[PDB]
A paper describes a structure:
To gain further insight into the structural conversions in pore formation, we chose pleurotolysin (Ply), a MACPF protein consisting of two components, PlyA and [name], from [name]. Previous studies have shown that PlyA binds membranes and is required to recruit the pore-forming MACPF protein [name] to the membrane surface. PlyA and [name] together form relatively small and regular pores in liposomes. The membrane attack complex/perforin-like family (MACPF) proteins form the largest superfamily of pore-forming proteins identified to date.
The 2.2 Å structure of [name] reveals an N-terminal MACPF domain (blue/red/yellow) followed by three small β-rich domains clustered in a globular trefoil-like arrangement (green). The MACPF domain of [name] contains a central, four-stranded bent and twisted β-sheet characteristic of the MACPF/CDC superfamily (red). The TMH1 cluster of helices (yellow) is located on the inside of [name], next to the concave face of the central β-sheet. TMH2 (yellow) comprises a single large α-helix and an additional β-strand (termed “strand β5”), located on the edge of the central β-sheet. Together, the central β-sheet and the TMH regions constitute the topologically conserved MACPF/CDC pore-forming fold. A single [name] moiety was fitted into the upper part of the pore structure. The C-terminal trefoil (green) and the α-helices at the top of the MACPF domain (blue) unambiguously fit the EM density with only minor structural rearrangement.
Residue numbers in the entry:
A (entry chain A), B (entry chain A): 55 to 182, 184 to 519
Amino acid sequence: LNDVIQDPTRRNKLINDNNLLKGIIMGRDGPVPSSRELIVRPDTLRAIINNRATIETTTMEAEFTETLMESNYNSASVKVSAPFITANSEYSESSSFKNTETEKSMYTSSRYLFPQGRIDFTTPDSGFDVIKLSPQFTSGVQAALAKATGTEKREALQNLFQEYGHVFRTKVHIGGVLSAHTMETFSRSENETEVKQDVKAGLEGAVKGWGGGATAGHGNTQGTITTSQNRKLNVKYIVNGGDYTKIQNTEEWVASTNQSEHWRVIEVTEVTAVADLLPQPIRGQVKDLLKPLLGKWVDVEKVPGLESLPVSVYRPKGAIPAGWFWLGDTADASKALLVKPTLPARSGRNPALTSLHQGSGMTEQPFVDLPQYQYLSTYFGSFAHDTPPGSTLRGLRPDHVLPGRYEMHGDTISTAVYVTRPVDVPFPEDECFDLKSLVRVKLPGSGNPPKPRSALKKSMVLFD
Amino acid sequence: LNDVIQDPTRRNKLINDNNLLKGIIMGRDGPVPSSRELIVRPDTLRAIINNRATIETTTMEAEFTETLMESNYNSASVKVSAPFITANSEYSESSSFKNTETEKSMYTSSRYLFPQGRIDFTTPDSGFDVIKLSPQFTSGVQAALAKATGTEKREALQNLFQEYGHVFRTKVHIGGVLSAHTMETFSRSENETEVKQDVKAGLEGAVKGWGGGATAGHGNTQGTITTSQNRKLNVKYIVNGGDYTKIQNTEEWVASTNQSEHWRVIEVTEVTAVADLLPQPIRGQVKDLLKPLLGKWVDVEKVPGLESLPVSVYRPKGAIPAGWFWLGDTADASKALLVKPTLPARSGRNPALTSLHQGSGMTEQPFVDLPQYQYLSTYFGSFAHDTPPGSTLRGLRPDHVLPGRYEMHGDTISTAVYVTRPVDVPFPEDECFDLKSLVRVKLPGSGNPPKPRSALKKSMVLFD
Ligand SMILES: [Cl-]
Ligand SMILES: [Cl-]
């Protein structure tokens, strides 16, 4: 029983085995627990009893989240952890996750939970026993903010989060779990609702058949499933908790999930960013210093030889200050945003920006130098990385951008352009800049790069 | 002091004066407290001490939220309350809130908070003292679910929420507040970021000048402000808490906010839907019965005489069952969604669906019979409300839809169409159906209705 475990020193076994005192490092190797304790060891754990077995499913369209899906993070935990795994991922041109003009990808994870309960860590500035950060971490923050220069403070803070972790798990389900994980690539011509429901039912069916003893028993393995609509899927099967030596006989493994010794984290229900646990004044100072870009609003000038276009095309009217960069052609006649990276370049660290090169095809459009980086606008001219204004044009690390929305302008497809705006959902969780990024509807020639449809996140840019 | 008030019977004065035990009715007259108690009177209130005065701002693009903005609900509370005020609002063709092809509107509220603390009501199935629903409400739910037919159960549940409320305030700030509320209509050609920041700084400046004693003192009133960018705004000034008889001398009012007797709710920090407070089995039964539409997937047939179009146009292949309705022309060659309302028509109650009429202009497109209702597709032909398939075509109540996203198709503007898809944000709070709703890029003739860009919410449709 959950209440029984929380009473003596066996609650310390539950805390220690599950790394409940440690922040989670979001890196290229997936979610990794810190070797250092983030919080002070509590006298008691806040537990909600729930022994009801259920099948839960998570559908995820965000790239770089596969290791979080496989660690049974729910959508709310993936959301908070997503900028950190994205920023620290190993980018590749050969990824199977495809987001093209004709195709899209998604991850689907189903989990047959055999729980005992939920453990809650009360965050500071919330009603309740509350989280107390370890003095070792607090001293690290103080030592980081005490550095002579802005660059030194940011480098020490970066080192501090790489050691302590990016997020802390504030709500976790404890018990045993049998989970199935998949990825699917489908045509944009398909009904998204039909594809999602078909993959979810097929995955739920596989975990349902595995759990409760109906299919041939197995442990951690790879398998293939066929949905009702004939989609063939590569499935990864994962076991967490219970006695793994008993996994061959499903019902014997299920019974072993009632043993306090074999209880493990079975779902990450809620996660909090480590910087958000910091007290009120320091919190804002740390968060400002963590922003990868500096921002500046500057004057614009109209691009000549664009009389054919339905709208006026703009670029910063510089005199672009040394070390500053621009992000693409705009329909904003008033101002342009310039950006400057706050962190020095280091081997193993993904920079906030990437330079661009003209494509080897018949095209004159830029291509990102660093794989999987994104840019905001089509280039209205002939790009060259060695000549202005292309020499100071930059692409962005994928954690910096979210999908935008097009507003089409033009009386002919050949002259037609899209003006990128932030999505107009009434209750956004994240806010983006309205930069009025210009995208060509029909680009001339072949070998042209995928058309951008992105908006820059406001949380990534520090002003003044 | 907050801790001092919570100890004797003066905590009951704080609970009673602020209606902390009552659900909030979201109707045409704004947020109205229920006359009936939703929860059992607690022995103690969970309080977080915070006497730090701050200026907070909320920007809201959602229509029908003005009375929530004026009641100092933050964006998270507006979000949860929004479907309920939208569904119960008094619709009008003469609203100043404009969302056209060339213009958009938004609400901005700034509040100069003079707090004492925050009161938290712990929801059932959450760590902590927890909420216990009143036996009068619980008996009402049981009596509603005991009705002979589906229609009778739904009517009794509707009556139950109109009496008890749609939402419950789970986190509230207590003290005194000076707030300014405005609305702004601007051209889509404008930078949204610049407009939002300009209105927020102008509104923050007005509350800053009012509070702390710098401008001429006043109480609840209407005024005009001018932003840094020469935008002229109609401002509504509201006072909550403190001694209102002392409002003329700002500093005397500020000092009166430290008196336990004058503490009022100053911000609605978190709100929970009343149905979400219900225990696990009943919760799902109530939520299914509250859905305004029944759903059914049916076969489609291609619309003839559409050879010129870049895509195939579809309508349900009916034999449309009696009492069922369709929602517009689609590019979905496999299936079509049919809808049926679950509640009977009643005077004063906004129906889930509206019939349509052909516009009096040169147009052949349908127009909603009920003001402010929305539809999903342009009609690919000549609409008539008295002939099939137009006789069974229906528009939707604004709470049923969210903005969608266009995917353009066509080699000529005149033949070009948009296929509506759900927004592709990676972490949506709300999910919509992908219906592949077809919208004409360039409609022939004048007097044509505003082009739709909407997706139907999945939470509004009950299947099987
Ligand atoms: Cl290339
Ligand atoms: Cl009309």
